[PDB]
Design a protein around this ligand. Structure first.
Ligand SMILES: *[C@@H]1O[C@H](CO)[C@@H](O)[C@H](O[C@@H]2O[C@H](CO)[C@@H](O)[C@H](O)[C@H]2NC(C)=O)[C@H]1NC(C)=O
Ligand SMILES: *[C@@H]1O[C@H](CO)[C@@H](O[C@@H]2O[C@H](CO)[C@@H](O)[C@H](O)[C@H]2NC(C)=O)[C@H](O)[C@H]1NC(C)=O
Ligand SMILES: *[C@@H]1O[C@H](CO)[C@@H](O[C@@H]2O[C@H](CO)[C@@H](O)[C@H](O)[C@H]2NC(C)=O)[C@H](O)[C@H]1NC(C)=O
Ligand SMILES: *[C@@H]1O[C@H](CO)[C@@H](O)[C@H](O)[C@H]1NC(C)=O
Ligand SMILES: *[C@@H]1O[C@H](CO)[C@@H](O)[C@H](O)[C@H]1NC(C)=O
Ligand SMILES: *[C@@H]1O[C@H](CO)[C@@H](O)[C@H](O)[C@H]1NC(C)=O
Ligand SMILES: *[C@@H]1O[C@H](CO)[C@@H](O)[C@H](O)[C@H]1NC(C)=O
Ligand SMILES: *[C@@H]1O[C@H](CO)[C@@H](O)[C@H](O)[C@H]1NC(C)=O
Ligand SMILES: *[C@@H]1O[C@H](CO)[C@@H](O)[C@H](O)[C@H]1NC(C)=O
Ligand SMILES: *[C@@H]1O[C@H](CO)[C@@H](O)[C@H](O)[C@H]1NC(C)=O
Ligand SMILES: *[C@@H]1O[C@H](CO)[C@@H](O)[C@H](O)[C@H]1NC(C)=O
Ligand SMILES: *[C@@H]1O[C@H](CO)[C@@H](O)[C@H](O)[C@H]1NC(C)=O
Lengths: 317, 167, 316, 167, 167, 316
């Protein structure tokens, strides 16, 4: 009699790349690089904030677009392309560092500054920000002098961080659209804004002048920020052109942020996100988006890689 | 007719990966080797369990899609990310190539381990013909097929059979 | 009677490394780390502008070393150690980012703005660099006073960027050698320059220096860079000491600019360029220059790694 | 007089890598096994073709040799480049060491495959002597040994003569 | 009474790693091989010498524990460092896994080299029992157990007796 | 008769991670990840400077707490958490770049610049920095504007670097803390400081606003630094608040700097350090400190990795 050993085979099979030769036929192989996704952000079991029309940095300054998100608390922050953190033209300096701080911040817990002003009207307003009629940013007071061309007095203000967590202090400098506007707004004189703390010192100079019109007006606000250690005091000195904070922003905990263009799905549990959706798959690698964040597979360039899950497909005769 | 792994695979094994084919005076056919299949599957699944292990490192955004970062730090980030991507593409191709080479060599090694086990079990009662078959000089139609598939084969009773007939 | 099996061996083999033992002798081996370069920059099939005493950054402002490269197209941009990006002494702010985008620019295109305002001397010149008599960068006007000791008028000017591509705008601020030089060039006042756009908004102030003398003069031009998004408007506002651009610049395509100190060849082709030459090789690694630019082998520290291409060299 | 791969290689096997050496009453000589060397060299060329693959990622300048970049960003770039250089130096040494071990093990496994194929083809008509040769017990001419090289040697011969020569 | 590496190890083999056990007329005994253990130890020592070596690239601090660096550069440094840590954690886990696999397969290979060398040395005077032992059919004393231990065994003067005992 | 071949075994071995199975028992294995450390700093055979109560930058400006380290020479520089760089309140711009330069500097070799002043008070006494009475930084001269309210002349000073190595030149700007104090201390009017060189140019303006009072004083000194190439010259121009350097700082050679919170043990040899001690090991990996500085094993996340040093364990 006779006995013989052998092994299973299929008529088709798939091909894999090996160490010595490429294109080896195997019975089956799987992919280690994910290409299938859900074109929506799946976020379940996490507090998610959908910052639709308002940029993440506006959750400090309070443009009308995010009046409901001033004190938001979330584990996952969604930032969208159509939004903006500016309602009066301008930008933050070192805005990327502050965005990185906010994405990890866990949300914003605002505690009032406790500042009292005298001889200065705090009801400044612009036509660009339109919460109702004309209104300015919610979390900041646009300081004026009194009447048109009235002088702005020099003053000193200070804030002590009485909590255990560090405070995020944000303020702005107003750059008027012309010297005539500054003549009307803040009167006339040399302007200097000085900011300091035990480990921080800077000063800013307003620079009035003609600029391209954005959202109907040429005036601009440059937003600046400070990270204040516990028991430290921030001292501010004004001659005008100051957009003053009303409350200090404390961080609530830990979170992550996403820049994305798709809707939020509350049903799936997912860790890896990219601008087109979420990648929920326990594969070693992905070839979808090199900037994907979270607990995500490693990005590779290959369109596909087939890792054999069995031996070579020696065909039957 | 009785194909062997040395020349050809089998399309008749649907109950496992490795197995035996038999030809005798009562019938012909196949059977799967449960233990060899389960061992090879356990090693490959453990390999996948290593490869598919989730990373615990949380990564944050250091770029910006909506606005641009400063060009010098932007290009430094792009270069670092592309160099890391080249490193991970190299590791991914090396890992897949080495796991595919190890998987094929492992399964063929396991086939050799079973083959040597059968040869060692049969000793002087069978001869390798180079096609993956064992030519057996001890006539058996029924019990020997299961006994050889198992380890509960006592080659000594038929031993006389596998010398008289092959000399 | 006797059938023997064996393999080809050589009496004088080559040593390779393995995971378990070093110095294992094999019949044949090749290198995986390239150590040999070709001394010349061999560029064929790629448009190459062989800059001399002009660096890449200077091709925006147009110094006399590269008047012939005021506008150009290229696939390869070569900077030289002996070259300079200025003629009148000066420095760019964030000069590395601007050079980095220029190396990728593919060349340069142009448009023009104007600065035709009266009362302004639009053809100022210095003794540092000349074409025949005293001259200045073709791309800048200086905007000096029309007469001596005359107050510079405050002015505004804007550019609309009516093109699909983003515009590369470069302008200078003049830091006078002394306060007396500033009074000579511009009348008395507190000088202020602002640049507006939807995403720039930067203010600059001239600061008279009393600095050391470079290229014969103590004054200096501080060159500032703005990359302007399509259809956005740049607004300049200044009281003087403003080295205004004549032309607005644009990107042309894609290039891979390099830095080198050696001559350019043209009878062969390769992708990897570095300061001392090019690397033309298909080996996976190289050990010539950690700063090598292009689609080239990956840099390693080892001088040589030998990959066996044959059997273990067991003699006799 | 004649020894095989177990004790020594050959210096006169100029054509090919794998081969046979022969002693008979008609003389002595050497001949290469074309198929084994061709397969082994094709596998090594495929290995080289994988290693000599050129990347399609074009890297640009981040530092600047003529004018030094800022010390903090320059030091971050130098640290990142030194770490990447350490990664690629490790990967290069690991790749070269692994591929050298796999080339040596591949050559020896293929040599063993040829050795076992000869043993399997000869069956009881030959016995290995432990030094890389098989002693042939019956006498034969060059043509049947060329058939062994040709993989056409039929063992269904007058086995009794070989058996009497062994016993 | 005694079994080999196929089914179990041998507790009590203190001197060396590889060796022989004997069931002689004098009874049970154990002895070290010494050559195969030293070969395996030299190869493992070589592997450790290659991996257990410090680098020659000195790294400087690019951040500061007492006073925190700027958030943008700090986050770029932290991201790059975490990606490098992920690369080295992957490389360390992969290196340890393949070196453990190679060490285990190397040691089993060395056990096999000793086993095949003994098989080739004994030729037809011994037959495998399937448990990693050789059943010898010629009565052989301690002097001849020692002749088996080293490479001094001569097939001649036992062939006729062992064949008559086997046939 | 029968012979059996085999291998040794132990009753209790150790487990290792292989490619296919997580828990293979082996006879022997060794760690590749170092977890043991010594709480003390191993600094034998090396010149070591223990900068107690003094930061790295305090060896440049010279606060009283750093008086003994002004001209220190070292191969290993240890910075302490309890130390400080600044005595009179303030900070540097680009602190990290300057600390990185000093750590690799090899030590500091100072030479006097030779600046002579007349009509200026150079005492600059401050209660925040003391040796006896009130005494300012040993190596910096706080140029008060003579008697109170007196005008400060617009001085120009220069230093030429004649040595083979580049010079490290440090200066500061005084932010008085109020306009009343700036007017009293430096006289009335606006102040401007400019710095020029071949490859560096800058200007600074004092900011006399109001700040949180630290260590008894509300003003702050903003310190700035310049790397001066050989045979070049740095020229300073100032209307006050210059806090002039007294000596230029030259680099001695090469060293490595560390940060540490523990005492120095000079009888132990090693070459890689971390915050809590030293790591003396020849193993390829560590799990001690991901930011360790020196020639340390590569950091991995895994607490322990065992690399087998023997075969597999088969218990019988
Ligand atoms: C390189 O860095 C620049 C900014 O410095 C960044 O714009 C590049 O990526 C951009 O990513 C966008 C989102 O995917 C994409 O829409 C945009 O086209 C792309 N920029 C370019 C020029 O193609 C960075 N490179 C990469 C690969 O991300
Ligand atoms: C980054 O490393 C490079 C070396 O690859 C440094 O460049 C060298 O610096 C030394 C310093 O004296 C010069 O002598 C060499 O000529 C330089 N070589 C090149 C190719 O530039 C560079 O300075 C380092 N950067 C930093 C910020 O430390
Ligand atoms: C980069 O990572 C380091 C740790 O590797 C961070 O430093 C830690 O920060 C936390 C913040 O609460 C402190 O509690 C730790 O004591 C710090 N450790 C060390 C060694 O400094 C650092 O903050 C990270 N960088 C950024 C920008 O977040
Ligand atoms: C082969 O692998 C594929 C991978 O998707 C799997 O679906 C299939 O069931 C596997 N087949 C066997 C017989 O294991
Ligand atoms: C300083 O901060 C700590 C918390 O970090 C707090 O417990 C302590 O009370 C603070 N000091 C004072 C005087 O309140
Ligand atoms: C051999 O194994 C089969 C299962 O494959 C079993 O049914 C049979 O009883 C076994 N034979 C013996 C003798 O145990
Ligand atoms: C090869 O031979 C030459 C001289 O014939 C000798 O110098 C050289 O060292 C040999 N190669 C090796 C690796 O020893
Ligand atoms: C090694 O292989 C290369 C392949 O191109 C060949 O040119 C060379 O002559 C070979 N050398 C030896 C000694 O076999
Ligand atoms: C080898 O086999 C082929 C098969 O067709 C045959 O044609 C050839 O003559 C054979 N050569 C020898 C030497 O046996
Ligand atoms: C082999 O072992 C025997 C034991 O007595 C000894 O006499 C003999 O010399 C040994 N031969 C070699 C080559 O070690
Ligand atoms: C493991 O090996 C080391 C060095 O080879 C040795 O010091 C140690 O005692 C060994 N341990 C065991 C349990 O064999
Ligand atoms: C400076 O220039 C002079 C000019 O003769 C030269 O002799 C001297 O060596 C130079 N010094 C340095 C440090 O370059």
């Amino acid at each position: 009699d006779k006995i013989c050993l052998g092994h299973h085979a299929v008529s088709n099979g798939t091909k894999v790349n090996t160490l010595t030769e490429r294109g080896v036929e195997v019975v089956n192989a799987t992919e280690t690089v994910e290409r299938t996704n859900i074109p929506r952000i799946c976020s379940k079991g996490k507090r998610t904030v959908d910052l639709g029309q308002c940029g993440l940095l506006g959750t400090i300054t309070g443009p009308p677009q995010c009046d409901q998100f001033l004190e938001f608390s979330a584990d996952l922050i969604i930032e969208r392309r159509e939004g903006s953190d500016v309602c009066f033209p301008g930008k933050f300096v070192n805005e990327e560092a502050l965005r990185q701080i906010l994405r990890e911040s866990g949300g914003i817990d605002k505690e009032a500054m406790g500042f009292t002003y005298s001889g200065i009207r705090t009801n400044g307003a612009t036509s660009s920000c339109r919460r109702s009629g004309s209104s300015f940013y919610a979390e900041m007071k646009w300081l004026l002098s009194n009447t048109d061309n009235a002088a702005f007095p020099q003053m000193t203000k200070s804030y002590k961080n009485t909590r255990k967590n560090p405070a995020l202090i944000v303020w702005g400098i107003h750059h008027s659209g012309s010297t005539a506007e500054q003549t009307k707004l803040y009167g006339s004189g040399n302007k200097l804004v000085t900011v300091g703390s035990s480990n921080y010192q800077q000063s800013f100079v307003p620079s009035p002048g003609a600029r391209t019109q954005v959202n109907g007006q040429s005036g601009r606000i440059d937003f600046h920020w400070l990270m204040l250690n516990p028991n430290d005091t921030v001292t501010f000195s004004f001659n005008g052109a100051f957009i003053a904070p009303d409350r200090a922003s404390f961080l609530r905990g830990k979170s992550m942020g996403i820049q994305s263009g798709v809707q939020v799905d509350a049903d799936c549990e997912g860790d890896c996100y990219y601008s087109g959706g979420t990648i929920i798959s326990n594969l070693p690698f992905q070839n979808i988006d090199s900037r994907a964040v979270g607990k995500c597979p490693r990005y590779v360039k290959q369109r596909s890689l087939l890792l054999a899950t069995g031996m070579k497909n020696v065909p039957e005769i | 007719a009785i194909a062997g792994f040395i020349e050809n695979g089998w399309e008749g094994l649907i109950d496992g990966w490795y197995g035996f084919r038999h030809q005798n005076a009562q019938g012909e056919g196949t059977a799967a080797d449960y233990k060899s299949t389960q061992s090879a599957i356990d090693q490959i699944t453990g390999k996948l369990n290593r490869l598919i292990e989730k990373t615990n490192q949380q990564f944050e955004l250091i770029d910006n899609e909506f606005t641009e970062v400063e060009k010098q730090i932007g290009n430094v980030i792009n270069w670092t990310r592309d160099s890391i991507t080249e490193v991970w593409s190299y590791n991914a191709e090396l890992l897949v190539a080495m796991e595919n080479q190890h998987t094929i060599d492992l399964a063929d090694s396991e086939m050799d381990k079973l083959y040597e086990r059968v040869k060692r079990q049969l000793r002087e009662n069978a001869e390798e013909d180079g096609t993956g078959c064992f030519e057996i000089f001890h006539k058996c139609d029924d019990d020997c097929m299961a006994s050889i598939r198992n380890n509960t084969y006592d080659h000594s009773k038929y031993r006389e059979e596998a010398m008289q007939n092959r000399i």
